[PDB]
């Protein structure tokens, strides 16, 4: 009673896909060492040309979930390294139909979007060293990466190693809705205050980022290739997916909105980051389209359940007050800590040079946890 069934989330990986695929069958053998060599085929400036003089591979060869995800993964760094190139300013507003069609194809199989996504990067972009060892950054690795030293490793482990821990209060779930149907108080108390600690602890996995990225690599490097073609000067009305779509299509760049954990928190705590017509709100909705989709059910699924944070509010109960707000103090605090590791890798480096406003998505997003408070 979890159902890591019916939504995808596992008990010790969560949103993450367990286990990720590290290779693909032979025939896509031209696909994964384009993806494998994208640091010195950018480098050498051969890249487009090589993926130019590709042959339109067939996505019926894809069997599993697991071979489809890594195809998605392949296929979404070659699009971001043919797009963004070097990343100086010379732009392919064209995506070649040999590459186009099929992630096209593979992307309306898997309901996702044609552009790299942080279920892509993220959550299945991973493998573990030794199988035997835990899930620990020292016994983990990326699959891909864009060029050397874009600290591509840091910024997609780090943020698997949150998303991992903050698994652990997803299992709870579950007794959180059954405790307050059945009406069991001391239960619910519990599992909040098991939420609240889960929370807490993916606090200290955050402080991971300051020893595996530096500001000018992330800043100046890895961001080019993270970018989209949805409000994009550089790319005005999108990119054209050749011999797929006859109009160039808008579509969002890499996001953290799109981590399921983070969503679900602030349904289940209902705190209003969803609900309005304002900015903030709207992205955060836009982006669970860019979610795998047993994903985005789960969280229009915990919409369907009763609140938790008007339950709470019901009863003059002090200690269930301060559980529930536990929960809501531990999702602000990790928002401040992250506004402040923003301020490091995007507003410094850009003074040493917009980031104005991904500040002010934040900090209302921020101000709107705070703001949920009960007191
Ligand atoms: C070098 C470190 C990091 C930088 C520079 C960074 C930067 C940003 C920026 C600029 C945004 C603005 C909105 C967007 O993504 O479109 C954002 C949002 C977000 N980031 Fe990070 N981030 C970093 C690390 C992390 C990590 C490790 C996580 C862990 C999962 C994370 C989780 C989030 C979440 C959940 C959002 C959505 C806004 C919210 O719900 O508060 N970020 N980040
Ligand atoms: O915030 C965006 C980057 C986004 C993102 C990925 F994309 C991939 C993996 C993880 C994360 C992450 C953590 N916290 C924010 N994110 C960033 C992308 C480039 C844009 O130009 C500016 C925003």
Not at 221 to 247: H, T
Request: aromatic content about 10%.
């Amino acid at each position: 009673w979890t159902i890591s069934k019916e939504y995808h989330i596992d008990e010790e990986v969560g949103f993450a896909l367990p286990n990720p695929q590290e290779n693909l069958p032979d025939f896509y053998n031209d696909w994964m060492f384009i993806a494998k060599h994208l640091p010195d085929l950018i480098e050498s400036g051969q890249l487009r040309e090589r993926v130019e003089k590709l042959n339109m591979l067939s996505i019926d060869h894809l069997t599993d979930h697991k071979s489809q995800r890594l195809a998605r993964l392949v296929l979404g760094c070659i699009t971001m390294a043919y797009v963004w190139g070097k990343g100086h300013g010379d732009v392919r507003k064209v995506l070649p139909r040999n590459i186009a069609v099929p992630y096209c194809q593979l992307s309306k199989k898997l309901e996702l979007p044609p552009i790299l996504v942080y279920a892509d990067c993220v959550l299945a972009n991973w493998k573990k060293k030794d199988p035997n060892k835990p899930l620990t950054y020292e016994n983990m690795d990326v699959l891909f990466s864009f060029r050397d030293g874009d600290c591509s490793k840091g910024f997609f482990l780090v943020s698997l190693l949150v998303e991992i821990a903050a698994a652990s209060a997803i299992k709870v779930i579950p007794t959180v809705f059954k405790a307050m149907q059945m009406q069991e108080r001391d239960t619910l108390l519990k599992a909040l205050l098991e939420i609240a600690s889960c929370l807490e602890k993916a606090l200290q996995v955050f402080h991971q980022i300051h020893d595996h990225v530096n500001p000018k690599a992330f800043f100046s490097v890895l961001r080019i290739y993270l970018s989209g073609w949805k409000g994009n000067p550089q790319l005005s009305d999108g990119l054209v997916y050749e011999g797929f779509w006859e109009d160039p299509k808008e579509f969002a760049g890499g996001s953290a909105g799109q981590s399921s954990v983070f969503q679900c928190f602030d349904v289940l705590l209902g705190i209003q980051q969803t609900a309005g017509g304002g900015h903030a709100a709207q992205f955060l909705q836009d982006m669970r389209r860019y979610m795998p989709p047993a994903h985005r059910n789960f969280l229009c699924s915990l919409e369907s359940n009763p609140s938790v944070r008007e339950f709470v509010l019901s009863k003059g109960d002090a200690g269930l007050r301060e559980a529930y707000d536990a929960c809501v103090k531990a999702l602000v605090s990790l928002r401040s800590y992250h506004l402040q590791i923003v301020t490091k890798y995007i507003l410094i480096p850009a003074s040493q040079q917009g980031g104005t406003d991904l500040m002010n998505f934040l900090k209302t997003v921020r101000s709107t946890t705070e703001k949920s408070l009960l007191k």
